[PDB]
């Protein structure tokens, strides 16, 4: 059975990501914006129960618990195509509508006020899950609502499922884009703190990489938080298709991530997708070969992590696994491995056996795929530390500069100082250093 994931949507960015994810999932499964399967959606081969619950035999409701400290995101969800997809009893919106003021602490306190409702929503979504593994919270770490509410949701998932794994997709603030959330580094630090203490694995999603990909590959000059969240949701959908469309391989999230998470502390994951295409370029189904796919994967425009140019550390991939979905020729896979080796397209750890695992997944039959073959890569790469190290450096710079702390000072957790943010930044720095160490043979003795 699939490993079901409960989705927690926090703040503006998290709610936008959830809305776009639900739209994409509905389109792939032929589910109407109300959660009902379209008459053309006759391929009952998709696993809705991993991410969605059935409200009726026809109506699919996401196994999602929506927790936010700002009413704007809840209103945007209710104005989204997925407004009727989710169970309204599983949506928690802060009554004060005042948001978190871009303060992680305010968002966390609002989540704490809605803790009971949020955990009831999460439990309701789990009961709609045939084999709920745990909860996955999708939020941004840069805002006030999405950061604080995301940490609160993670805490409540940890409280309710303390023996179950809790993975988070935590969007770290863009370091190349000027964040409108001046307190974004403090919020990001608090979210990284919660991922360190209450999550078992944190996949670092650098909003800088999302903006860079939108600019260079999607030709989006200014990716909005909603647009960045929708890009993240599209990437998550493509990577999760093998969980939602069961096949011979990658039928569960844990099977996909097992190769990616070598140690409990080295749990910072990077993501990759190939072939990378802009949303506008869907028209031309390029007969991309596995060699061409692998060549495109090496392009930074397709990497979901914005690693800084570290000049001192030769950050490297310890291992890379590409899960490819669609029409794939094994001879093309062989040529891809050959071309990667000749071009040295992937560096592996030198201290143990590592390879490119290949998972084959079916495409949604109801959603026309513009690509004959698509693929998600999960890889352990020391450059993923650069995203976490960059988030930590920004957090430390904001706390040391008391930047935007007056908005945080309204909440008791951040009223006097941002020391929790600085300690979180230090923990994330240690995580980055461990991720860089994981490229080295001495990772065996880490901890």
């Amino acid at each position: 059975m699939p490993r079901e994931i409960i989705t927690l949507q926090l703040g503006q960015c998290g709610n936008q990501i959830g809305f776009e994810f639900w739209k994409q999932l509905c389109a792939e499964h032929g589910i109407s914006p109300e959660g009902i399967v379209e008459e053309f959606a006759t391929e009952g081969t998709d696993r809705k129960d991993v991410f969605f619950y059935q409200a009726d035999d026809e109506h699919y409701i996401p196994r999602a618990v929506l927790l936010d400290l700002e009413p704007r995101v809840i209103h945007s969800i209710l104005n989204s195509p997925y407004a009727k997809l989710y169970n309204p009893e599983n949506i928690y919106l802060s009554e004060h509508g005042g948001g978190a003021g871009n303060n992680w602490a305010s968002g966390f306190s609002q989540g704490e006020k809605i803790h009971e409702d949020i955990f009831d929503i999460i439990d309701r979504e789990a009961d709609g899950s045939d084999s709920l593994e745990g909860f996955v919270l999708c939020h941004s770490i840069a805002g006030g609502t999405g950061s604080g509410l995301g940490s609160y949701l993670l805490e409540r998932l940890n409280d309710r499922y303390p023996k179950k794994l809790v993975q988070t997709y935590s969007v770290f603030p863009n370091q190349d884009e000027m964040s409108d959330v001046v307190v974004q580094p403090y919020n990001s630090l608090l979210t990284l703190k919660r991922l360190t203490q209450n999550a078992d694995c944190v996949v670092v999603l650098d909003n800088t990489a999302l903006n860079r990909i939108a600019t260079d590959r999607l030709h989006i000059q200014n990716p909005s938080f909603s647009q960045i969240n929708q890009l993240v949701s599209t990437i998550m959908s493509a990577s999760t298709t093998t969980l939602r469309y069961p096949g011979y391989m990658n039928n569960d999230l844990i099977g996909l991530i097992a190769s990616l998470i070598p140690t409990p502390r080295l749990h910072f994951l990077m993501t990759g997708y190939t072939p990378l295409t802009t949303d506008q370029s869907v028209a031309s189904v390029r007969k991309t070969t596995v060699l061409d796919v692998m060549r495109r994967l090496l392009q930074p425009k397709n990497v979901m992590v914005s690693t800084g140019r570290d000049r001192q550390t030769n950050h490297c991939y310890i291992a890379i696994l590409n899960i490819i979905q669609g029409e794939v020729d094994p001879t093309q896979v062989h040529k891809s491995l050959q071309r990667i080796r000749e071009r040295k397209l992937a560096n592996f750890i030198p201290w143990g056996p590592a390879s490119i695992q290949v998972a084959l997944s079916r495409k949604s039959p109801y959603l026309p795929s513009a690509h004959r073959v698509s693929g998600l890569m999960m890889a352990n790469h020391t450059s993923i530390s650069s995203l976490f190290e960059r988030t930590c450096r920004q957090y430390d710079k904001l706390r040391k500069r008391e930047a935007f702390l007056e908005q945080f000072r309204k909440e008791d957790m951040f009223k006097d100082n941002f020391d929790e943010m600085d300690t979180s930044r230090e923990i994330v720095q240690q995580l980055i250093d461990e991720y860089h160490a994981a490229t080295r043979p001495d990772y065996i003795s880490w901890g």
């Binding site: 009952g44 081969t45 998709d46």
Partner: protein
């Protein structure tokens, strides 16, 4: 088998109904860390006439 079919989207399909779990032999004890521990399980496929001329018992045995 019932739990796996109930959890499978294809488990209730008539094609899944042609699957049968049979035992090749009954081990006294499950050997720990043996990769072949579950080799006693066989999935058999029934072929009716005339398909059993083409889908031979040898073919079904190799599939098993």
């Amino acid at each position: 088998l019932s739990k796996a079919l109930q959890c499978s989207l294809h488990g209730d399909t008539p094609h899944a109904s042609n699957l049968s779990l049979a035992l090749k032999y009954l081990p006294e004890v499950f050997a720990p860390n043996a990769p072949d521990v579950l080799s006693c399980l066989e999935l058999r496929y029934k072929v009716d006439w005339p398909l059993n001329i083409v889908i031979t018992e040898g073919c079904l045995s190799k599939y098993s």
